[PDB]
């Protein structure tokens, strides 16, 4: 087409979606990861994760307001990935990399799994 | 912090949100602009428009599934701006620029109003 494009638009949208999450505005699901609860927007979760895409496109599960994750999932790993979904920034550290990679494999976040594998390979 | 950042993440999220809109997945509002209806996600509308931010943060209006816009609003102008919200690309043409600018002023989309004013100034 003959369109013009605003370079910063996608980043500005994501920043605003994170501000809505912070202020608990229009969050429509609670993700339970053992004893912890995380509020989020179903659409952002689906846009970032192959697992959430499959869950919320399912005719029965799309209507649930609470989703319980597998008990093997580490809440800190999930928290780091949820922050990544809303900000593009991944808080990857020697002390959390294995939990983050395991959580990203479960959530089906291929780009995160890729960077974790590379950082692990560099340590070996 | 000591974060790493995935450059393409925000653009990839927006592309996926537009794919959900296309497939009518988890759209939760209908915007009525005279005889036309547009389905969208409340969170994306709020992230892009000062008008929708004010509407969906209001305790009564946040619960509405249908929003009727002012009858002076042109449906084509709205359609062009809705596509911009979901893609960062603005289909600005000599034949639609006045309707687009008027709609962006009403929706409170300051960056769109700015580019329309500049293209109009260049024509004069």
């Amino acid at each position: 087409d003959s369109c013009i494009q605003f370079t910063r638009h996608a980043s500005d949208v994501l920043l605003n979606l994170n501000r809505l999450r912070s202020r608990d505005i229009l969050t429509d699901v609670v993700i339970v990861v053992s004893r912890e609860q995380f509020r989020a927007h179903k659409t952002v979760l689906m846009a970032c994760s192959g697992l959430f895409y499959s869950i919320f496109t399912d005719q029965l599960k799309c209507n649930l307001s609470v989703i319980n994750l597998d008990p093997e999932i580490n809440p800190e790993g999930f928290c780091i990935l949820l922050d990544f979904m809303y900000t593009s920034r991944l808080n990857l550290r020697e002390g959390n990399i294995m939990a983050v990679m395991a959580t990203a494999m479960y959530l089906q976040m291929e780009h995160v799994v890729d960077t974790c594998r590379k950082f692990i390979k560099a340590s070996e | 912090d000591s974060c790493i950042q995935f450059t393409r993440h925000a653009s990839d999220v927006l592309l996926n949100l537009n794919r959900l809109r296309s497939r009518d997945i988890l759209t939760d509002v209908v915007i009525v602009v005279s005889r036309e209806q547009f389905r969208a996600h409340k969170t994306v509308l709020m992230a892009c428009s000062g008008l929708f931010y004010s509407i969906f943060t209001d305790q009564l209006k946040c619960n509405l599934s249908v929003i009727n816009l002012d009858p002076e609003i042109n449906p084509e102008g709205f359609c062009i701006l809705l596509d911009f919200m979901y893609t960062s690309r603005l289909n600005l043409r000599e034949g639609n620029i006045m309707a687009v600018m008027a709609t962006a002023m009403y929706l409170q989309m300051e960056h769109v109003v700015d580019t329309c004013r500049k293209f109009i100034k260049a024509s004069e």
Partner: peptide
């Protein structure tokens, strides 16, 4: 704004 840019030409994409």
């Amino acid at each position: 704004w840019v030409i994409p």
